[PDB]
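Submission sheet (multi-component)
Chains listed below:
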Amino acid sequence: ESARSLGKGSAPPGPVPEGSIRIYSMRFCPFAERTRLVLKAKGIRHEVININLKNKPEWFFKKNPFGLVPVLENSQGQLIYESAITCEYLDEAYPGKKLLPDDPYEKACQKMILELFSKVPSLVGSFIRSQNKEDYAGLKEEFRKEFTKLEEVLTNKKTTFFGGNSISMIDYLIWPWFERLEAMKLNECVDHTPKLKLWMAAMKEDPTVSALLTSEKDWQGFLELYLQNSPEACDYGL
Amino acid sequence: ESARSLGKGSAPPGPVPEGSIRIYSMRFCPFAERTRLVLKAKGIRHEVININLKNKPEWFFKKNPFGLVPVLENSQGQLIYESAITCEYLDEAYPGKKLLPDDPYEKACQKMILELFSKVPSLVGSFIRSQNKEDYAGLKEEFRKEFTKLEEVLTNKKTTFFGGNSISMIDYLIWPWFERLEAMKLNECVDHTPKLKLWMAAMKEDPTVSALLTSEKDWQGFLELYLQNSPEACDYGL
Ligand SMILES: *CC(=O)Nc1ccc(Cl)c(S(=O)(=O)N(C)CCOC)c1
Ligand SMILES: *CC(=O)Nc1ccc(Cl)c(S(=O)(=O)N(C)CCOC)c1
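Outcome: structure written.
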């Protein structure tokens, strides 16, 4: 019940309490998962408001002019949007495990890997446009070309994760699209990328990843409603 | 002569000397201008190699797998690519005026403005596809819609520049597309954005901006060669 989304007609929410940060999220949004993985990895006390992205509250555009999740709002009333900006803000503003390195070059390397990854989220988009076994063969080739680039980074570094032998920001920033691969029937696309495939196994063992992972049944329930343009897609399961 | 570009058949260059950083650039590339504005604003000793982007040296893909400028290479042999990553790396790695704020929220704000700007560079692309007075009217409307978003930020802050009353990273990151507006005959697109129009006048007075500004005759010379796919476009004037 508590996780039910707010949509059109919902009262603007009150001030974020001191000692807490608020995320405007949607339970199946991969971009907002980035921000929730960081909040959990850093142990930041927070509250979640889920937004019905099919049936947005008008007041939500006061939080983010683009009308997109994720959005952070703190007790001072500051608003931060764009998933990679929300994650970096949280790593700098809060104590705990640093997810980005302090060294400028190593930090730039994490960003360059994110850049290597930057076509993957629009391919997941495009997966919607796949109607038949022919489009599905092309889609799989497109994922393979992108995954080879990430495979090369792990072969150069010979580390468990993209930022070294410990999980760091860059892993959490790319993870949500890998999480969705099995439910999209694109698991085979890591078959030519053995290190990327072991990276996925190591990610699923991470306490933070494991605490936020959605079951394939849960993601399928969402997608089917999403693809009808159902106002209930966002509240699948509730 | 010294600024002449290296292209196909050119010897791989030697190691970057200690005390210097190298940029792989192209004299009329707006993305690489971002990095050169930062190098100049921060007083960083550097050397420039200009790349013939129409006739790339094969060795240039060893600097950047994407084959794009800008690229930084330091004396340790580290490579940094993507214009916004090269600029942030330089602000963190070198002394002088900080171009990004230390406060995490104010830094996130600069990034959110960059996000507001993110459609402008592909419209400049698209300006190439404009053939006639009708396409030019549509193009102008598209620039206006984007410029209104930046106009709102200056009206909210009531500062000279996008990051406060002093010029900072965010100004240098968006400047190169405004510099090119007069030569593209898109000067009129700031006519409904009076604060953005005054921001352009303040930018042209900045010592760093003014030191790197290319004349309209120089940019026209480049564009005409560029649009023929001339291998000499990059060396216009030399
Ligand atoms: C927050 C969010 O879900 N944004 C977003 C925007 C575009 C696309 Cl394509 C996606 S998706 O790849 O997960 N897919 C279409 C399912 C929809 O997720 C809302 C997500
Ligand atoms: C470095 C660089 O010039 N990159 C680049 C990539 C695409 C586009 Cl469209 C441009 S441009 O908007 O300046 N224009 C097409 C002129 C070409 O500049 C090389 C630049």
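Remark: DSSP finds eleven helices and four strands in chain A.
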